Design a protein around this ligand. Structure first.
Ligand SMILES: C[C@]12CC[C@@H]3c4ccc(O)cc4CC[C@H]3[C@@H]1CC[C@@H]2O
Lengths: 236, 9
C-alpha cells in the first residue's frame, strides 16, 4: 500500500533516486556484440531500478519478474532514446559510444530499429521531455507492459492486476501535477499526457521488432552469450 | 529458473 500515499513531489523524488547510473560501454557480429554487452550490463541496473520503483516490490515475486521480462527492451529504449535526445541523428548508447544511423546498418534489419529509436528521440526532443516526465513514463512502461499478459486465474493475481492500475493512475496524476507546474492550460496538460502515452505504444512496437531482431541474431549465433540478456529473450 | 530471479530476488 505504501505506493499510493506518496505525492507528485514525493513520487517524482523516488523515481529520481532510483535512476540507474550512466553505464559506459566497452563486423555484424561485433556491432551486435557491442549493444548486447551494454544491454546485458544495463539489464542489471534495470532490475535494481525496478525494485526501488514504488509499488513494485508490493507486486509479486512472480509478477515482478513478468513485468520485467515484458518491458525490459521497452525500458532500454525509452532510456536509450532519452539519452539520445540532445544528440539529433544519433543514439547515445553510452557516453563512450555515440552510434549513428548508418552504424545501424552494420547489422541486418538493425538500421530500421535505430530509425524508429531516433524518431522518438526527435519526438521527445521537439516535445521537450523532462526527466521527471521521463522517470514517470519509464515506470508506467514497466507497469503497463506485462499488465495484460498475466495469469489472471488466481484471485491473488486479480489483486495484483488492480493494484497496478491504482499505481499507474497515481503516476498519471504525478505527470499531471508535473505538467501543471510548467503552466499549461488543462488542454495543453492532458494534450500532453496523451502526447507521451501514445509514444509508449510506439515503444512497444519498437520493443517488439527489437525483440524479434534480437531473437534472430540469437539464431545466427552472432550475439555473445550474455546469460542475463539471453534469458530476457527466452521469455518471448 | 534464475539471474533475473536472483537479482530481483
Ligand atoms: C536489442 C538490440 C540490442 C540492445 C540495444 C540496446 C542496448 C542498450 C540500451 O541502453 C538500449 C538498447 C535499444 C536497442 C537495442 C537493440 C534493438 C535490436 C537489437 O537486438
Amino acid at each position: 500500500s505504501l505506493a499510493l500515499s506518496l505525492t507528485a513531489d514525493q513520487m517524482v523524488s523516488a523515481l529520481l533516486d532510483a535512476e540507474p547510473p550512466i553505464l559506459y560501454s566497452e563486423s555484424e557480429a561485433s556491432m551486435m556484440g557491442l549493444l548486447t554487452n551494454l544491454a546485458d550490463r544495463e539489464l542489471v541496473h534495470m532490475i535494481n531500478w525496478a525494485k526501488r520503483v514504488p509499488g513494485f516490490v508490493d507486486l509479486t515475486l512472480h509478477d515482478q519478474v513478468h513485468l520485467l521480462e515484458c518491458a525490459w527492451l521497452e525500458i532500454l529504449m525509452i532510456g536509450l532514446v532519452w539519452r539520445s535526445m540532445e544528440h539529433p541523428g544519433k543514439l547515445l548508447f553510452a557516453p563512450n559510444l555515440l552510434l549513428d544511423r548508418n552504424q545501424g546498418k552494420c547489422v541486418e534489419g538493425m538500421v530500421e530499429i535505430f530509425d524508429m529509436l531516433l524518431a522518438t528521440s526527435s519526438r521527445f526532443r521537439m516535445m521537450n521531455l523532462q526527466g521527471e516526465e521521463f522517470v514517470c513514463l519509464k515506470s508506467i512502461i514497466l507497469l503497463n507492459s506485462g499488465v495484460y499478459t498475466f495469469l489472471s486465474s488466481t484471485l491473488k493475481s486479480l489483486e495484483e492486476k488492480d493494484h497496478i492500475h491504482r499505481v499507474l493512475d497515481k503516476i498519471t496524476d504525478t505527470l499531471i501535477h508535473l505538467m501543471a507546474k510548467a503552466g499549461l492550460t488543462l488542454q495543453q496538460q492532458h494534450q500532453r499526457l496523451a502526447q507521451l502515452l501514445l509514444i509508449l505504444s510506439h515503444i512497444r512496437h519498437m520493443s517488439n521488432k527489437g525483440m524479434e531482431h534480437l531473437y534472430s541474431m540469437k539464431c545466427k549465433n552472432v550475439v555473445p552469450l550474455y546469460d542475463l540478456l539471453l534469458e530476457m529473450l527466452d521469455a518471448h | 529458473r534464475x539471474i533475473x530471479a536472483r537479482x530481483x530476488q
